[PDB]
Coordinates of all heavy atoms in Angstrom, one line a residue:
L30 N -0.2 -4.2 -2.7 CA 0.5 -3.0 -2.4 C 1.9 -3.3 -2.0 O 2.0 -3.9 -0.9 CB -0.2 -2.1 -1.5 CG 0.6 -0.8 -1.0 CD1 0.8 0.1 -2.2 CD2 -0.1 -0.1 0.1
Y31 N 2.9 -2.9 -2.7 CA 4.3 -3.3 -2.4 C 5.0 -2.2 -1.6 O 4.7 -0.9 -1.8 CB 5.1 -3.6 -3.7 CG 4.6 -4.9 -4.3 CD1 3.5 -4.9 -5.1 CD2 5.3 -6.1 -4.2 CE1 3.1 -6.1 -5.8 CE2 4.9 -7.3 -4.8 CZ 3.8 -7.3 -5.6 OH 3.4 -8.4 -6.2
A32 N 5.9 -2.5 -0.8 CA 6.8 -1.7 -0.1 C 8.2 -2.1 -0.4 O 8.6 -3.2 0.1 CB 6.5 -1.6 1.4
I33 N 9.0 -1.4 -1.2 CA 10.3 -1.8 -1.6 C 11.3 -0.9 -0.9 O 11.2 0.3 -0.7 CB 10.5 -1.6 -3.1 CG1 9.3 -2.2 -3.9 CG2 11.7 -2.3 -3.6 CD1 8.8 -3.6 -3.4
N34 N 12.4 -1.6 -0.4 CA 13.5 -0.9 0.2 C 14.4 -0.2 -0.9 O 14.3 -0.6 -2.1 CB 14.4 -1.9 1.0 CG 13.9 -2.0 2.4 OD1 14.1 -3.1 3.0 ND2 13.3 -0.9 3.0
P35 N 15.1 0.9 -0.5 CA 15.9 1.6 -1.5 C 17.0 0.7 -2.2 O 17.5 1.1 -3.2 CB 16.6 2.7 -0.7 CG 15.7 2.9 0.5 CD 15.1 1.6 0.8
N36 N 17.3 -0.5 -1.6 CA 18.3 -1.4 -2.2 C 17.6 -2.4 -3.1 O 18.3 -3.2 -3.7 CB 19.1 -2.1 -1.1 CG 18.1 -2.9 -0.2 OD1 17.0 -3.1 -0.4 ND2 18.7 -3.4 0.9
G37 N 16.3 -2.3 -3.3 CA 15.6 -3.3 -4.2 C 15.0 -4.5 -3.5 O 14.3 -5.3 -4.2
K38 N 15.2 -4.6 -2.2 CA 14.7 -5.9 -1.5 C 13.3 -5.5 -1.0 O 13.0 -4.4 -0.5 CB 15.6 -6.3 -0.4 CG 17.0 -6.8 -0.9 CD 17.6 -7.7 0.1 CE 19.1 -7.4 0.4 NZ 19.9 -8.6 0.8
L39 N 12.4 -6.6 -1.0 CA 11.0 -6.3 -0.6 C 11.0 -6.2 0.9 O 11.5 -7.0 1.7 CB 10.2 -7.6 -1.0 CG 8.8 -7.6 -0.5 CD1 7.9 -6.6 -1.2 CD2 8.2 -9.1 -0.7
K40 N 10.3 -5.1 1.3 CA 10.0 -4.9 2.7 C 8.8 -5.7 3.2 O 8.8 -6.5 4.1 CB 9.9 -3.4 3.0 CG 10.4 -3.0 4.4 CD 9.7 -1.7 4.8 CE 10.7 -0.8 5.6 NZ 10.0 0.5 5.9
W41 N 7.6 -5.4 2.5 CA 6.4 -6.2 2.8 C 5.4 -5.9 1.6 O 5.7 -5.1 0.7 CB 5.7 -5.8 4.1 CG 5.6 -4.3 4.3 CD1 6.4 -3.5 5.1 CD2 4.6 -3.4 3.8 NE1 6.0 -2.2 5.1 CE2 4.9 -2.1 4.3 CE3 3.5 -3.6 2.9 CZ2 4.1 -1.0 4.0 CZ3 2.8 -2.5 2.6 CH2 3.0 -1.2 3.1
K42 N 4.3 -6.7 1.6 CA 3.3 -6.6 0.6 C 2.0 -6.8 1.2 O 1.8 -7.7 2.0 CB 3.5 -7.5 -0.6 CG 3.6 -9.0 -0.3 CD 3.6 -9.8 -1.6 CE 4.1 -11.2 -1.2 NZ 5.5 -11.5 -1.6
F43 N 1.0 -6.0 0.9 CA -0.4 -6.0 1.5 C -1.4 -6.4 0.4 O -1.4 -5.7 -0.7 CB -0.7 -4.7 2.1 CG -2.1 -4.7 2.8 CD1 -2.1 -5.0 4.2 CD2 -3.2 -4.5 2.1 CE1 -3.4 -5.0 4.8 CE2 -4.4 -4.5 2.8 CZ -4.5 -4.8 4.1
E44 N -2.1 -7.4 0.6 CA -3.1 -7.9 -0.4 C -4.4 -7.2 -0.3 O -5.0 -7.1 0.9 CB -3.3 -9.5 -0.3 CG -3.8 -10.1 -1.5 CD -4.6 -11.4 -1.2 OE1 -4.2 -12.0 -0.3 OE2 -5.5 -11.6 -2.0
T45 N -5.0 -6.7 -1.4 CA -6.3 -6.2 -1.5 C -7.2 -7.1 -2.4 O -6.7 -8.0 -3.0 CB -6.2 -4.7 -2.0 OG1 -6.2 -4.8 -3.4 CG2 -5.0 -4.0 -1.5
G46 N -8.5 -6.7 -2.4 CA -9.5 -7.5 -3.1 C -9.5 -7.2 -4.6 O -10.3 -7.9 -5.3
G47 N -8.7 -6.3 -5.1 CA -8.7 -6.0 -6.5 C -7.4 -5.3 -6.9 O -6.6 -5.0 -6.1
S48 N -7.3 -5.0 -8.2 CA -6.1 -4.4 -8.8 C -5.9 -3.0 -8.1 O -6.9 -2.3 -7.9 CB -6.2 -4.3 -10.3 OG -5.9 -5.6 -10.9
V49 N -4.7 -2.7 -7.9 CA -4.4 -1.4 -7.3 C -3.8 -0.4 -8.4 O -2.7 -0.2 -8.6 CB -3.3 -1.5 -6.2 CG1 -3.2 -0.2 -5.4 CG2 -3.7 -2.6 -5.2
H50 N -4.8 0.1 -9.1 CA -4.4 1.2 -10.1 C -4.1 2.5 -9.4 O -3.3 3.3 -9.9 CB -5.5 1.4 -11.1 CG -5.5 0.5 -12.3 ND1 -6.7 -0.1 -12.7 CD2 -4.5 0.0 -13.0 CE1 -6.4 -0.9 -13.8 NE2 -5.1 -0.8 -13.9
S51 N -4.6 2.7 -8.2 CA -4.4 4.0 -7.5 C -3.0 4.1 -7.0 O -2.3 3.2 -6.6 CB -5.4 4.0 -6.3 OG -5.2 5.2 -5.5
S52 N -2.5 5.4 -7.0 CA -1.1 5.7 -6.6 C -1.1 6.0 -5.1 O -1.9 6.8 -4.6 CB -0.6 6.9 -7.4 OG -0.6 6.7 -8.8
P53 N -0.2 5.3 -4.4 CA -0.2 5.5 -2.9 C 0.2 6.9 -2.5 O 0.8 7.8 -3.3 CB 0.8 4.5 -2.4 CG 1.5 3.9 -3.6 CD 0.9 4.5 -4.8
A54 N -0.2 7.3 -1.3 CA 0.1 8.6 -0.7 C 0.5 8.5 0.8 O -0.1 7.6 1.4 CB -1.1 9.6 -0.9
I55 N 1.4 9.3 1.2 CA 1.9 9.1 2.6 C 1.5 10.4 3.4 O 1.7 11.5 2.9 CB 3.4 9.0 2.5 CG1 3.9 8.1 1.3 CG2 4.0 8.4 3.9 CD1 5.3 8.0 1.2
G56 N 0.9 10.1 4.5 CA 0.6 11.2 5.4 C 1.7 11.7 6.3 O 2.9 11.3 6.1
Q57 N 1.4 12.6 7.2 CA 2.5 13.2 8.0 C 3.0 12.3 9.0 O 4.1 12.5 9.5 CB 1.9 14.4 8.8 CG 2.0 15.8 7.9 CD 1.8 17.0 8.7 OE1 2.0 16.9 9.9 NE2 1.6 18.1 8.1
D58 N 2.3 11.2 9.3 CA 2.8 10.2 10.3 C 3.3 8.9 9.7 O 3.6 8.0 10.4 CB 1.6 9.9 11.3 CG 0.4 9.3 10.6 OD1 0.4 9.3 9.3 OD2 -0.4 8.8 11.3
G59 N 3.5 8.9 8.4 CA 4.1 7.7 7.7 C 3.1 6.7 7.3 O 3.5 5.7 6.7
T60 N 1.8 7.0 7.5 CA 0.8 6.1 7.0 C 0.8 6.1 5.5 O 1.1 7.1 4.8 CB -0.6 6.4 7.6 OG1 -0.5 6.8 8.9 CG2 -1.6 5.3 7.5
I61 N 0.3 5.0 4.9 CA 0.2 4.8 3.4 C -1.2 4.7 3.1 O -1.9 3.7 3.4 CB 1.1 3.6 2.9 CG1 2.5 3.7 3.5 CG2 1.1 3.6 1.4 CD1 2.9 2.4 4.2
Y62 N -1.7 5.6 2.3 CA -3.1 5.6 1.8 C -3.1 5.3 0.3 O -2.3 5.9 -0.5 CB -3.7 7.0 2.0 CG -3.8 7.4 3.4 CD1 -3.0 8.5 3.9 CD2 -4.5 6.8 4.4 CE1 -3.0 8.9 5.2 CE2 -4.5 7.1 5.8 CZ -3.7 8.2 6.1 OH -3.7 8.6 7.4
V63 N -3.9 4.3 -0.1 CA -4.1 4.0 -1.5 C -5.4 3.3 -1.7 O -6.0 2.8 -0.8 CB -3.0 2.9 -2.0 CG1 -3.3 1.5 -1.5 CG2 -2.8 3.0 -3.4
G64 N -6.0 3.6 -2.9 CA -7.3 2.9 -3.2 C -7.0 1.6 -4.0 O -6.0 1.2 -4.3
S65 N -8.2 1.0 -4.3 CA -8.1 -0.3 -4.9 C -9.4 -0.5 -5.7 O -10.4 0.1 -5.4 CB -7.9 -1.5 -3.9 OG -8.4 -2.7 -4.5
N66 N -9.3 -1.4 -6.7 CA -10.4 -1.8 -7.5 C -11.5 -2.5 -6.7 O -12.7 -2.6 -7.2 CB -10.0 -2.6 -8.7 CG -9.9 -1.9 -10.0 OD1 -9.9 -0.7 -10.0 ND2 -9.9 -2.6 -11.1
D67 N -11.2 -3.0 -5.5 CA -12.2 -3.6 -4.6 C -13.1 -2.6 -3.8 O -13.7 -3.0 -2.9 CB -11.5 -4.5 -3.6 CG -10.7 -3.8 -2.6 OD1 -10.5 -2.6 -2.7 OD2 -10.3 -4.5 -1.6
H68 N -13.1 -1.3 -4.3 CA -13.9 -0.2 -3.8 C -13.4 0.4 -2.4 O -14.1 1.3 -2.0 CB -15.4 -0.7 -3.8 CG -15.9 -1.1 -5.2 ND1 -17.3 -1.2 -5.4 CD2 -15.3 -1.5 -6.3 CE1 -17.5 -1.6 -6.6 NE2 -16.3 -1.8 -7.2
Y69 N -12.4 -0.2 -1.8 CA -11.9 0.3 -0.5 C -10.8 1.3 -0.7 O -10.0 1.2 -1.7 CB -11.4 -0.8 0.4 CG -12.5 -1.7 0.9 CD1 -12.9 -2.8 0.2 CD2 -13.1 -1.5 2.2 CE1 -14.0 -3.7 0.8 CE2 -14.1 -2.3 2.7 CZ -14.5 -3.4 2.0 OH -15.4 -4.2 2.5
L70 N -10.7 2.3 0.2 CA -9.5 3.1 0.4 C -8.8 2.5 1.6 O -9.1 2.7 2.7 CB -9.9 4.6 0.6 CG -8.8 5.5 1.1 CD1 -7.6 5.6 0.1 CD2 -9.3 6.9 1.4
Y71 N -7.6 1.9 1.3 CA -6.8 1.3 2.4 C -5.9 2.2 3.1 O -5.2 3.1 2.5 CB -6.0 0.1 1.8 CG -6.9 -1.1 1.5 CD1 -7.5 -1.3 0.2 CD2 -7.0 -2.1 2.4 CE1 -8.2 -2.4 0.0 CE2 -7.8 -3.3 2.2 CZ -8.4 -3.4 0.9 OH -9.1 -4.5 0.6
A72 N -5.8 2.0 4.4 CA -4.8 2.7 5.2 C -3.9 1.6 5.9 O -4.4 0.8 6.7 CB -5.5 3.6 6.3
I73 N -2.7 1.6 5.6 CA -1.8 0.6 6.0 C -0.6 1.2 6.8 O -0.1 2.3 6.4 CB -1.2 -0.2 4.8 CG1 -2.2 -1.0 4.2 CG2 0.0 -1.1 5.2 CD1 -2.5 -0.7 2.7
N74 N -0.3 0.7 8.0 CA 0.8 1.2 8.8 C 2.1 0.8 8.0 O 2.2 -0.1 7.3 CB 0.8 0.5 10.2 CG -0.5 0.8 10.9 OD1 -0.7 2.0 11.3 ND2 -1.3 -0.2 11.1
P75 N 3.2 1.6 8.3 CA 4.5 1.4 7.6 C 5.1 0.0 7.9 O 6.0 -0.3 7.2 CB 5.4 2.5 8.2 CG 4.6 3.1 9.3 CD 3.2 2.9 9.1

């Protein structure tokens, strides 16, 4: 799961156990929710 800055430079990347076809979603507190082919729904801090 990639986090890209508006200038095109990489902020960070989080590795999961499978391909991330799922589209990320952002909560009211800035958390990033996304699913993965590894059966987990990941919650990653910004």
Side-chain angles (χ1 to χ4, degrees):
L30 170 69
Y31 291 81
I33 312 316
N34 271 148
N36 59 10
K38 294 205 230 209
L39 172 73
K40 218 206 217 173
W41 47 259
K42 59 175 162 258
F43 183 96
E44 200 208 328
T45 85
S48 281
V49 187
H50 277 139
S51 178
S52 300
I55 323 178
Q57 276 201 12
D58 62 348
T60 320
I61 310 127
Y62 303 109
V63 79
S65 155
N66 259 16
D67 72 348
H68 304 195
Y69 288 90
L70 164 64
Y71 282 90
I73 291 118
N74 299 292

